[PDB]
Design a binder for this molecule. Sequence first.
Ligand SMILES: CN(C)CCCS(=O)(=O)N[C@H]1CC[C@@H](n2cnc(-c3ccc(F)cc3)c2-c2ccnc3[nH]ccc23)CC1
Length: 292
Amino acid sequence: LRVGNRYRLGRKIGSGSFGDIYLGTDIAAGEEVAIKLECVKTKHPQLHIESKIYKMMQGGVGIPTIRWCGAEGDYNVMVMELLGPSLEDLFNFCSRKFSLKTVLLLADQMISRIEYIHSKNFIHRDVKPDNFLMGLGKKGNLVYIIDFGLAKKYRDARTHQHIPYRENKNLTGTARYASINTHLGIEQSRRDDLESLGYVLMYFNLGSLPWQGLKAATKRQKYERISEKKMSTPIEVLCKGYPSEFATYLNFCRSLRFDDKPDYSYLRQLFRNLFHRQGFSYDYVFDWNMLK
Ligand SMILES: CN(C)CCCS(=O)(=O)N[C@H]1CC[C@@H](n2cnc(-c3ccc(F)cc3)c2-c2ccnc3[nH]ccc23)CC1
């Protein structure tokens, strides 16, 4: 099917926080693209809201370029430059084992993406391996962040007024990577995006997390059981047998005040110093690059 007069819509490659993802073609420029379709007659319309967030992020390192946004037949449409596999897919493909070097390469960029998003007055609130994609081709060394479906302003663009402290709030993101505060029902802010990244990095290190695969009656009960496990697992127990840097990072995030601007620089320098002790070079040879 034609889309925006110059895009041909391919096959469904997967699914977003809302809407389905297709792998299409920019017929005119001969480039493969990604196309998010959302039903026009949907009760909870978002794509246009999401689009405006992607538009504010344009020109950022590790932000996918919008090609086109429109309505066509039954569908609202966003067309992005095509990106590669997610870190969840690359991790599955690497038998759920990343070398310390890959974890440190990823962590350096991922902190930087989260910092760029915070600089544009938004929190992500669904930091998880699925929402980081590697580029293709010459961009194969770049971690991209995607999916602003659950994202939200934390400060007014002009006044930089932080949102107010609120409690009694639905766990909206992914339970596995949620901050301890998020489980307590506190409004997500910058520190929470970074805590989540912290649980994502330890997931990369361990192959899983201790609160992963908990049985219960309902989703509601499972979340409580995850909260209970997270809060009763000390950070030094989670990170036992891994470099102290992972523990130091999570401790620093758990220390951050609701409205604190995090020291992104410090946290990058944390893993950079360890990178240098380990004698690794920043040559962007990830584990999946070594497969043959
Ligand atoms: C349990 N299993 C079955 C579910 C796991 C979830 S999944 O669906 O397999 N995960 C992948 C789906 C595609 C990917 N993705 C999600 N949204 C966009 C997107 C595309 C266009 C757009 F305008 C806005 C956003 C993409 C995506 C896919 C490929 N290239 C991309 N260039 C920019 C986004 C993107 C995330 C990774």
